[PDB]
Design a protein around this ligand. Sequence first.
Ligand SMILES: NC(=O)C1=CN([C@@H]2O[C@@H](COP(=O)(O)OP(=O)(O)OC[C@H]3O[C@@H](n4cnc5c(N)ncnc54)[C@H](OP(=O)(O)O)[C@@H]3O)[C@@H](O)[C@H]2O)C=CC1
Ligand SMILES: NC(=O)C1=CN([C@@H]2O[C@@H](COP(=O)(O)OP(=O)(O)OC[C@H]3O[C@@H](n4cnc5c(N)ncnc54)[C@H](OP(=O)(O)O)[C@@H]3O)[C@@H](O)[C@H]2O)C=CC1
Lengths: 337, 332
Amino acid sequence: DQPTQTVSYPQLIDLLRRIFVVHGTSPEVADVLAENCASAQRDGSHSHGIFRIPGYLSSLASGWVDGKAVPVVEDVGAAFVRVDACNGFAQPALAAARSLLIDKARSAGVAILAIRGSHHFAALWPDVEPFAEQGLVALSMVNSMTCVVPHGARQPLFGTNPIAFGAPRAGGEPIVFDLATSAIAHGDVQIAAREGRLLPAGMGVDRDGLPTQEPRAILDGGALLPFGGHKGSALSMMVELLAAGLTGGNFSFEFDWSKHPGAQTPWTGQLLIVIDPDKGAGQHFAQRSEELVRQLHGVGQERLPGDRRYLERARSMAHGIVIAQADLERLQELAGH
Amino acid sequence: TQTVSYPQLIDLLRRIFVVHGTSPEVADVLAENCASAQRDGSHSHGIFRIPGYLSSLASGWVDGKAVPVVEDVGAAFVRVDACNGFAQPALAAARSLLIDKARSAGVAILAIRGSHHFAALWPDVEPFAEQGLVALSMVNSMTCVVPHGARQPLFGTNPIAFGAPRAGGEPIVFDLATSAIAHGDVQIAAREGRLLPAGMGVDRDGLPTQEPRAILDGGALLPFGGHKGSALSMMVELLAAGLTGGNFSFEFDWSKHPGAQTPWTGQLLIVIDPDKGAGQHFAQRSEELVRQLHGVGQERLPGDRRYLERARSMAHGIVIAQADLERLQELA
Ligand SMILES: NC(=O)C1=CN([C@@H]2O[C@@H](COP(=O)(O)OP(=O)(O)OC[C@H]3O[C@@H](n4cnc5c(N)ncnc54)[C@H](OP(=O)(O)O)[C@@H]3O)[C@@H](O)[C@H]2O)C=CC1
Ligand SMILES: NC(=O)C1=CN([C@@H]2O[C@@H](COP(=O)(O)OP(=O)(O)OC[C@H]3O[C@@H](n4cnc5c(N)ncnc54)[C@H](OP(=O)(O)O)[C@@H]3O)[C@@H](O)[C@H]2O)C=CC1
């Protein structure tokens, strides 16, 4: 068995920041991605934690993604902001337009951020959480690379296309959910393939369209199924239309990295809608949401969306972030240690 | 089965509403909405709902003469107090202002509170897409859905609708309840003595059941897609009620109003100009997605079934059982 070790949250952030800088990103990009990736690891979002470092680096090395891209923030309407990520990562683009977006949301009541030409290789909750912490409601969508078969279709077309939502609550941490519209997140398949284990059944099919539990069968010519059936498929179509169609970014099937050995980041876009829930209101949203939480506990829902992550976050801050010795060593070597 | 034209059905339903106490304005809105559903083949939200509309109005549970109060509260934010009336009249009252804001600011929100919605949601978003705008709407209903992992129902069937324009056809539109099945369909299965597939609901003891009667007899429904659909349902409560100021699905009941059938909640609508400051045409992008979907084998796109039925209705009229027509005429 693999012996484990622990690293503090700030230590992990510094380690990842060094890795990104050494491998070609600007310091701003390194700061953003390091905190993001470390935060995912801290919260137990394993698929989008340090597991993504190799993919980040091979994508950078191949020239597929520009780690030093400077986002172009476009103020196109009283409540509309677009950002040309310029073939760089999505997070730095969001960070560049965040203050403007918030000003518009508070002033106009709601504001949209449409990121195009961006690479998103992480969880989505980190993108909406900060807005909720500031008393704002946020909804976001991002499309990936093709891997999901539309309901009733014979071949894959949609990406794993996640949707995230964040909202404030008067008595605690923001209510936040982040879910892939595919039965299981594509990242889950990669993890299973890595760990050499099988997946639960009814989540994907092989190259021949037959049911399978082998991650390799799904990754090699196969595909994932939309969650819940036709409804999840409709929501996945919505993500393509909103994260790409509306933003100007590529749909999940509109990019090819075959010419860039090592490329793994989807080159698409991201949509974010931020709302001041109390704009012109005669009540307080945060009070209403707290009541909903109370009623949820009342009917027996002990675990609300986000609770699991907050628990892992608490554990990580108390006992440190658990990491395989071999993985920590690899990260240290990549940082130059 | 007699055949009536779309405009004839509207006129007939409008008379029924006016005869039963609604204002002429509300009658026009509801008549067109209900007739439109019948026209598209959405029988669950067509004339089948008339009895429920009338029973709800009879007790005063819903105010058929309510006058929506539009509140312009932000460059991109509009609120409307439905004043215990139906949701559609409230939306119609603020629609022009909402569109002006969406086109100017780029996006705009309409938060309706104190409204009764007894219809499908696609009629609410489709018009915006017909005008080149993208629209997303959420409405919370009445307690009957058990949150994932919970022991008792709390959320309503809470539907979500989406509408977007496409360059080569009618709007791409989807409208879905976040519950595994719509309540109306549980009633139908009960009447037809049909069992439901596994996972739609539970009995009064919280045990899984396929018997629609067991679900209706103190039972409850389950969210679609397990924990994921449940999270979306929670979002609907928060957006259609928490944000609007209307009641959550569990903050009202029909105990004091015999015959009440409508939830008294709210509705959220987000309308976006997809091309605001864009160096492309959204309608061309969506059309390409449609082409690609056809390319991978998806023959049916959300809305296609209704558009096909709609064409038939406009070309051959709306076919209705003589029995139903007679009673509608009597109600009129
Ligand atoms: N291109 C990209 O960047 C992509 C990123 N992803 C990311 O990968 C992801 C993991 O997604 P997916 O696998 O769908 O996640 P899940 O299926 O775990 O979780 C969906 C979510 O469901 C809530 N939840 C899970 N189990 C329960 C339960 N039993 N009761 C109540 N709520 C519950 C979660 O809370 P909680 O977290 O606290 O457990 C969370 O909000 C996301 O973070 C997503 O953003 C996916 C596809 C593409
Ligand atoms: N309080 C209220 O007012 C409430 C209203 N409702 C309403 O009742 C409803 C019916 O909803 P629900 O039962 O969820 O509907 P379904 O489960 O039938 O349909 C969900 C939708 O799925 C699309 N769809 C269905 N089958 C396929 C397929 N094979 N391939 C591709 N797309 C497909 C539909 O297109 P399409 O339309 O063409 O069939 C539509 O957008 C809605 O209209 C809803 O608004 C529900 C709860 C509460």
